[PDB]
Amino acid sequence: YERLKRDILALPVRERRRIKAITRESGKKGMVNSVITQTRQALIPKVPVVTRPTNVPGNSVQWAQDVIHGFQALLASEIYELPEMDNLRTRMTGISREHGLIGPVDDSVIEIMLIGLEQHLKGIVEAAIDIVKYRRHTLTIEDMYDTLEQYPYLVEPGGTLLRLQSVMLHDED
Amino acid sequence: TLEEILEMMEDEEFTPIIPDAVTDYYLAKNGFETSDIKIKRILALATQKFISDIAQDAYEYSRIRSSSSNKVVLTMDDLRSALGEYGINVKRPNFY
Amino acid sequence: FKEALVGYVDDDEVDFEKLINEPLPKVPRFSTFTAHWLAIEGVQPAIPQNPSPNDIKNILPINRGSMEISNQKQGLEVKPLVKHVLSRELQLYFDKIVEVLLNQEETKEAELLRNSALQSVRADPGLHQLVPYFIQFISETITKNLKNISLLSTMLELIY
Amino acid sequence: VRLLHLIFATQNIYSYQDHVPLQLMDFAYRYTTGTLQDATIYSDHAHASNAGNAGTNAQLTTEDIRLAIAARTNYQFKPVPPKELLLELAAERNKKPLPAVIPTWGIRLPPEKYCLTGKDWVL
Amino acid sequence: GMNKKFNEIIHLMQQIRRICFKISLIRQMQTDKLDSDVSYNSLKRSISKILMANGFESTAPFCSDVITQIAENYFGNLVKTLKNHIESKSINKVMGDAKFQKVSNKDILLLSLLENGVESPDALYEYYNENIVKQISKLEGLKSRLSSFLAELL
Amino acid sequence: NLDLSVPLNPHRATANLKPEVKYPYYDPETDTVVHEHRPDARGNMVNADTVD
Amino acid sequence: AADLNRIVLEYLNKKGYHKTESMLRMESSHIPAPPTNIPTPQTTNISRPTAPGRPATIKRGYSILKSWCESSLDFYRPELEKFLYPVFVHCYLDLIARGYPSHAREFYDKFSKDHSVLHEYEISKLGGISLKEHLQENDVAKIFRSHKFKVLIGRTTFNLLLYFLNENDAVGGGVVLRLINQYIEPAQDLRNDIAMIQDSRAKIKLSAAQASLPSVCMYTFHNTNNDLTCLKFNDDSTMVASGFQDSFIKLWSIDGSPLRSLLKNDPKGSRRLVGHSGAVYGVDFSPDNRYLISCSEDKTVRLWSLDTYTCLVSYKGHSSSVWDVKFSPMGHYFATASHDQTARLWSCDHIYPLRIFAGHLNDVDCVEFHPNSTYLFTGSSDKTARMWDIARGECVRVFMGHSGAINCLAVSPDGRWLASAGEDSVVCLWDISTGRRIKAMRGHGRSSIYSLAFSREGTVLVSTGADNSVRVWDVKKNTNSPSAQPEATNDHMSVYFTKKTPVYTVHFTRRNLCLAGGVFGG
């Protein structure tokens, strides 16, 4: 079948195109496909440092003091409340410089983001409430794991669900 | 109400189109056994109703297609639209 | 994958145009198991549900390698004649065994001298290599002598 | 497609059922349609749409496709083995001691009210 | 099988009235342990017996397979819901030491219905009466068309 | 270069000494009984720590 | 190759607590273990069910006495019936004086119904005594121990009897013979008989226990439309359970239909288990053999009884399909393998996992426990194998080779040896200490190897594959115990072909024979 298959593939005029695809593609400086370097390079902070052949405008020099400041914030889950603007702004500048942008976030982004956030969480908790009672109760972790087994399209996988399946402790401990 | 609804499923006056055997198989597949007959007929009924809903979606979306005011066929455009209007995902078939 | 040409694309599907279906599926048998016997003591019978030497016709990359009258019967397709299979060690072990068995000197210590080898072969591993030699030996013992109460008693206890 | 059989040959799987090539080709068509659709949206986005502000002209460079694919794999397509996450997470679990007890030759079950008691379900 | 019997009466009335519709067009324009495959095909039978709307198995076959698989997924999603609530391992569920089930065995069922599709119970009563009214409604619509065509042909 | 690879006999890989057990029995009155360990948490009890 | 030596030696040079002295000892990962022995129940006692983080032998000796007797011949009943009661009361007096009066009471009124037809007042004689000083005041036992008791018995019977209590000094033979030579003598003669047993050790006890080619009995499963993943056989070889691909578990009874509940309801020998959502990929039995465990792709693990054929528990701590679930050799603890590139070790009482193990860059295909039950061996599709400390969590050893996946693993009873079977079709025998395979058995054509197993005593193993063939391999051809026994590659005793049947498992019984399971018939 293999020989006959190759012969029939040669029956098509694309035998020439098939003959040319012998090299190693990605004719670039490279596209690594390993794992550990993806991880590391996706773990260290980057820095948007710029060239200046003739003129690279922007009128505001690039800094990486911002990235350190961003990674140092008392982010959520330590504190007990959703972050107020200032914390979120400090974290964003870090991410924007860390991805390769420049210029300061303009104080409307934070608010629309908070808005979308609280909408998200109201949806989730409405789901859990729809689980526990049909029509004086009090809610637990297991109900939220149940509803994130039923509806997983809500949350993006990674990070937290694995962490969620490592917090379900037994009674005595 | 609700209690009439399990007053009624027991006797032959309301026996879903989905036969008892097939629903027993599908109960067993997804892992449920019980020596009641009501509940199985009930899941039968809800599924019957859901498919009826996509049926009417298909009927109306076929009725829009031409001449509002060689017989009928529920094709892939009608289905593409109704399944889409649900949460059922995109049907992008092809050729070549 | 029907063909179609344009002035080729090799695509069409002409499996449609149904109006009514009223067919019934037929149920197969349940999953039940068929035991047999295979490979008694190394040899593979071909009489019951087994193959004959037809894997010489198989594709040689696949299924590779092949090494392998009366009430006095104990096995013919096993070839116990050649005395190379047992071991160099096992012949001497068997000699020690038989010699400690057929001792028959006193009534105070000889039974104590053999009883622990008796109770050894009672419980010890890997003896399925030297069984038929043991069987032929003991049948030789019974057909050679009839008078000694001692030997027949020891053999009854050996079969226990 | 015969080339799909040729691609099957790379993984030593010459035992197909002939529905797979139809199915996987259908799949790739669906996938790339969605991909180069939202990439076209992003090409519009660089072209500064609303209820009439400018035109819509297509180039579709590789960067837009890269954007349209990274969003998909944001919630799909089993990624690189996330080892470090799992290592630290499991160290957090692998922290509190074993029970160090003796049920004395049986089975020790969870307490009833956590056990199931698989009776005939009934109202 | 009164539900089966009434869907069958819908089927018979559809057959006869659509036949009459078509010939009237012609005259106008003249001028137990069971297995997988049996289960699948039984479901396909039942499905194409649902379809009073179009015509009973009067569509391409891919769509029949589509519909079969979809309803399979839905039924499985039902049961995956009820059994999940039943295992629960949470204080809200779980028989209390003093036999206090915060939510008895029935709210489970009502609730699993609610999570998937159906909102309330009496929507089923509603869909049932809706079905039997669809029968007489389409009956009388095409019967009035029949009488008016019997008048028109003269 | 220090691992502890050393077995020891159970009651399961030999014979003549398989033990008895009396938890999975059959009462004449009741159906059967099992071994199931013991917490102190009851039903309708305080759930957990404060919300802070 | 040498580059690896270069780089690891530079590494160890940089590790300041690795000097040049001990770095070379670190390079002694190529000397394997010595040939060690199996712990017979002659010297080494039993151990208790416990944790992996670090009395009543009298009762077990009496259990030996009441078992070995009734299992004897009919000629020897009328004489050992009187050997029963006196040693029972003797051992009861021994323990109640040792310091466990409660235990004394419990096994007294447990074994007070031993000789109730002969002795009528003695149960009342010994029922009105609880405490040690209540014995020291009691006079009948004192006059009993003063003189000895007469015992009428032949010679060869006591010879063979003692020659049975020499092989089992593990859960109690020494105490009973000590009490005998103390009281009756119907341990001086005991010592002479121990020397006689040692004389049996000189060439009368078998030394090598060389190879032994196996018997087989096959079990082909017809009429399944390939809807069938796993089999598994029992411990005492009475049942065989197969996990289907539509959430079904169809217990089969070998040799009859006694599969009936103990209840009054539930009125042939095949029992089907529901309670699952997805396909079943692994099943395992309880070594006490009244329970059953079964993993699936719906990230459940589930527990069943076997006197009512009924579920009891569900388990959920996994994020993806669970392939194989295996018990501990002792009970109490079970483990699972998944597609979430992680493995979780469970108990049976607690419902969420105890430990989680994470070292695989792909899916963990199989899991197994070393015979001490303090290690777990995962094997994966990343072409690597690993070992874990259940308490520690983290990987003691890693074995790499085997271009291709992995599917099944085995452990030889004595604690040196693990078996790697994979799509490559080459069986590899690994040594835990070396981390380097001792042998590379070559055979089996070019097909996946699904299952395999060792002997009762590590003399022989068996592979079992998808090339429609089973393949017995010797194992000691070139190992540290080179048993040769003389008159594609070697270490291949014999191959038994099948009628176009891919085979799925094995189970060595106690005895010589294997027991197999395959499909597809013809």
Got the DSSP string for A48-65?
A: -----SS----SS---SH
Which letter does DSSP use for residue D120 in this model?
P
Smallest Cα–Cα separation from G39: which of E53, F9, C2, E112? F9
Q: Which neighbouring-strand residues pair with G389?
A: G375
Helices E36-50 and E2-28 cross at an angle (nearest 10°) of 50
Distance from CA of G308 to the nearest CA of F (A): 9
Buried b (16+ CB within 10 A) or exposed e, A88-116: bbbbbbbebbbeeebeeeeeeebeeeeee
Q: Which two tokens stand for residue A170?
A: 């037994």
Contact A157 D2 (CB under 8 A): no
Contacts of E95 in chain D (CB under 8 A): 113
d(CA G238, CA G233): 8
Sign of CA dihedral G310, G314, G319, G324: negative
Annotate G102-118 with DSSP letters as a single string: HHHHHHHHHHSTTSTTT
Buried b (16+ CB within 10 A) or exposed e, A65-85: ebbeebeebeeeeeeeeebee
CB-based burial label for G319 (10 Å; 0-12, 13-18, 19+): middle
Q: Which of C103, C108, C116, C120 to mutate: most G Cβ within 10 Å?
A: C116
d(CA C109, CA A17): 94
**CA angle in degrees (0–180, nearest 5) for A102-A107-A109:** 80
Distance from CA of B14 to the nearest CA of D (A): 20
Are residues C155 and C138 in contact, defined by beta-carbon separation less than 8 angstroms? yes
Q: Which two tokens stand for residue F33?
A: 């009984």
d(CA E36, CA G357): 38
d(CA G291, CA F31): 17
Sign of CA dihedral C73, C77, C83, C86: negative
Contact E90 A146 (CB under 8 A): yes
- G391 residue type, one letter: A
Which letter does DSSP use for residue C127 in this model?
G
d(CA F11, CA F16): 9
d(CA B12, CA B15): 6
CB proximity D32 to B under 8 Å: no
Please give, one letter per residue, the 3-state secondary structure of G395-420: EEEEEECCCCCCCEEEECCCCCEEEE
CB proximity E26 to B under 8 Å: no
Please give, one letter per residue, the 3-state secondary structure of E5-43: HHHHHHHHHHHHHHHHHHHHHHHHCCCCCCCHHHHHHHH
Distance from CA of F35 to the nearest CA of E (A): 17
Contacts of G318 in chain A (CB under 8 A): 165
Which letter does DSSP use for residue G213 in this model?
P
Please give, one letter per residue, the 3-state secondary structure of E74-125: HHHHHHHHHHHHHHCCCCCCCCCCCCCCCCCHHHHHHHHHHHCCCCCCHHHH
Residue with tokens 């006689």: G196
d(CA A166, CA A147): 17
Q: Which of residues 130-169 of A touch G (CB under 8 A)?
A: 161-162, 165-166, 168-169
Annotate B16-59 with DSSP letters as a single string: -SS-HHHHHHHHHHTT---S-SHHHHHHHHHHHHHHHHHHHHHH
Residue with tokens 């003093």: E98
After which residues does chain C break, using C–N > 2.5 Å? 7, 68
Q: For residue C47, give every residue at least 6 positions away whose Cβ sits within 8 Å of its Cβ, in sequence order, or none.
A: none
The values of phi and psi at residue G293, to 5°, are -130, 150
Buried b (16+ CB within 10 A) or exposed e, C43-52: bbeeeebbee
Element (H, E) at G255: none
Smallest Cα–Cα separation from G82: which of G65, G97, G106, G99? G65
Find the closest chain A residue to G341 by CA distance.
A162
Which chains does chain C touch, 3 or more C-beta pairs < 8 A? B, E, G
Are residues G475 and G515 in contact, defined by beta-carbon separation less than 8 angstroms? no
Q: Which two tokens stand for residue G243?
A: 């996990």
Contact C12 B96 (CB under 8 A): no
After which residues does chain B break, using C–N > 2.5 Å? 69
What's the CA dihedral at G387, G390, G395, G400 to 10 degrees? 10
d(CA G65, CA G58): 11
Element (H, E) at G98: helix G85-98
Question: CA G476: distance to chain centroid?
Answer: 22
SS3 of residue F11 by DSSP: coil
CB proximity F45 to A under 8 Å: no
Are residues G305 and G285 in contact, defined by beta-carbon separation less than 8 angstroms? no
Smallest Cα–Cα separation from G346: which of G305, G274, G295? G295
Q: Which of residues 24-53 of G touch C (CB under 8 A)?
A: none
**Closest CB from E89, E96, E109 relative to D114:** E89
**CA angle in degrees (0–180, nearest 5) for G497-G499-G504:** 70
CB proximity D123 to B under 8 Å: yes
Residue E138: CB atoms within 10 A of its CB come to 16
Distance from CA of F38 to the nearest CA of E (A): 12
Q: Which two tokens stand for residue E37?
A: 């495959």
Contacts of C10 in chain B (CB under 8 A): 96
Specify the pairing of strand G239-244 against strand G228-233.
antiparallel
CB proximity F44 to E under 8 Å: yes
d(CA B57, CA B46): 17
d(CA A132, CA C150): 84
d(CA C1, CA C13): 7
SS3 of residue G170 by DSSP: coil
Contact D108 F35 (CB under 8 A): yes
Residue with tokens 């982010």: A75
Q: What is the CA radius of gyration of chain E?
A: 23
Find the closest chain E residue to D114 by CA distance.
E89
SS3 of residue G232 by DSSP: strand
d(CA A171, CA B5): 40
In angstroms, the Cα distances linking A104 to A85, A91, A92 are: 14, 12, 9
d(CA A86, CA D66): 32
Specify the pairing of strand G216-221 against strand G228-233.
unpaired
d(CA G210, CA G474): 10
Specify the pairing of strand G216-221 against strand G516-519.
parallel
Q: Which two tokens stand for residue G136?
A: 């020291």
Which letter does DSSP use for residue D109 in this model?
B
Q: For residue A40, give every residue at least 6 positions away whose Cβ sits within 8 Å of its Cβ, in sequence order, or none.
A: none
Are residues G502 and G465 in contact, defined by beta-carbon separation less than 8 angstroms? yes
d(CA A68, CA A91): 10
Q: Which two tokens stand for residue A104?
A: 């300061």
Q: What is the CA radius of gyration of chain F?
A: 22
Q: For residue G316, give every residue at least 6 positions away whose Cβ sits within 8 Å of its Cβ, in sequence order, or none.
A: G299, G300, G301, G352
Contacts of D123 in chain E (CB under 8 A): 105-106, 109
CB-based burial label for G133 (10 Å; 0-12, 13-18, 19+): exposed
Q: Which neighbouring-strand residues pair with G376?
A: G369, G388
Q: Which of residues 30-59 of E touch G (CB under 8 A)?
A: 33, 35-36
CB-based burial label for G296 (10 Å; 0-12, 13-18, 19+): buried
Residue with tokens 């063979």: G160
Sign of CA dihedral E33, E35, E38, E39: positive
Please, how many CA atoms are within 13 Å of residue G212, restricted to the half-sphere of its CB? Answer: 24
Contacts of G276 in chain B (CB under 8 A): 31
Smallest Cα–Cα separation from B31: which of G228, D117, G278, G309? G278
Residue with tokens 């699993």: E112
Q: Which two tokens stand for residue E120?
A: 């309330």
Q: What is the CA radius of gyration of chain A?
A: 26
Q: Which two tokens stand for residue C32?
A: 């039940």
Contact A9 D3 (CB under 8 A): yes
Smallest Cα–Cα separation from E88: which of G505, C124, G226, A141? A141
Q: Which two tokens stand for residue G516?
A: 């197999």
After which residues does chain G break, using C–N > 2.5 Å? 54, 186, 267, 487
CB-based burial label for G249 (10 Å; 0-12, 13-18, 19+): buried
Q: Which of E63, E85, E104, E114 to mutate: most B Cβ within 10 Å?
A: E63
The values of phi and psi at residue E92, to 5°, are -60, -45
Are residues G62 and G84 in contact, defined by beta-carbon separation less than 8 angstroms? no
Element (H, E) at G337: strand G333-338
In angstroms, the Cα distances linking A111 to A92, A107, A108, A114, C148 are: 13, 7, 6, 5, 109
CB proximity B32 to G under 8 Å: yes
- B32 residue type, one letter: F
Which chains does chain E touch, 3 or more C-beta pairs < 8 A? A, B, C, D, F, G
Longest dimension (CA), chain A: 76
Q: Which neighbouring-strand residues pair with A149?
A: none
Contacts of G277 in chain E (CB under 8 A): 76, 79-80, 83
Q: For residue G99, give every residue at least 6 positions away whose Cβ sits within 8 Å of its Cβ, in sequence order, or none.
A: none
Smallest Cα–Cα separation from G295: which of G272, G311, G278? G278
- G59 residue type, one letter: K
Contact D121 E87 (CB under 8 A): no
Contacts of B27 in chain D (CB under 8 A): none
In angstroms, the Cα distances linking D37 to A68, B85, D30, D58 are: 38, 19, 11, 11
Residue D31: CB atoms within 10 A of its CB come to 14
Element (H, E) at C47: none
In angstroms, the Cα distances linking D118 to B31, B34, F32, G18, G108 are: 12, 10, 13, 58, 38
Smallest Cα–Cα separation from G314: which of G301, G299, G296? G301
SS3 of residue G375 by DSSP: strand
Distance from CA of G249 to the nearest CA of C (A): 12
Please, how many CA atoms are within 13 Å of residue C90, restricted to the half-sphere of its CB? Answer: 23
d(CA B30, CA G72): 52
Are residues G463 and G435 in contact, defined by beta-carbon separation less than 8 angstroms? no
Q: For residue G395, give every residue at least 6 positions away whose Cβ sits within 8 Å of its Cβ, in sequence order, or none.
A: G357, G359, G386, G387, G388
Resolution (A): 20.0
In angstroms, the Cα distances linking B15 to D1, E5, G179, G308 are: 48, 9, 77, 32
- Do B and F make contact via 3 or more CB pairs under 8 A? The reply is no
Chain A residues near any Cβ of chain F (below 8 Å): 80, 138, 140, 171-172
Annotate G423-471 with DSSP letters as a single string: TT---EEEETTT-SEEE----STTS-EEEEEE-SSSSEEEEEESSSEEE
d(CA C125, CA G456): 9
Contact A165 G318 (CB under 8 A): yes
Specify the pairing of strand G437-439 against strand G449-454.
unpaired
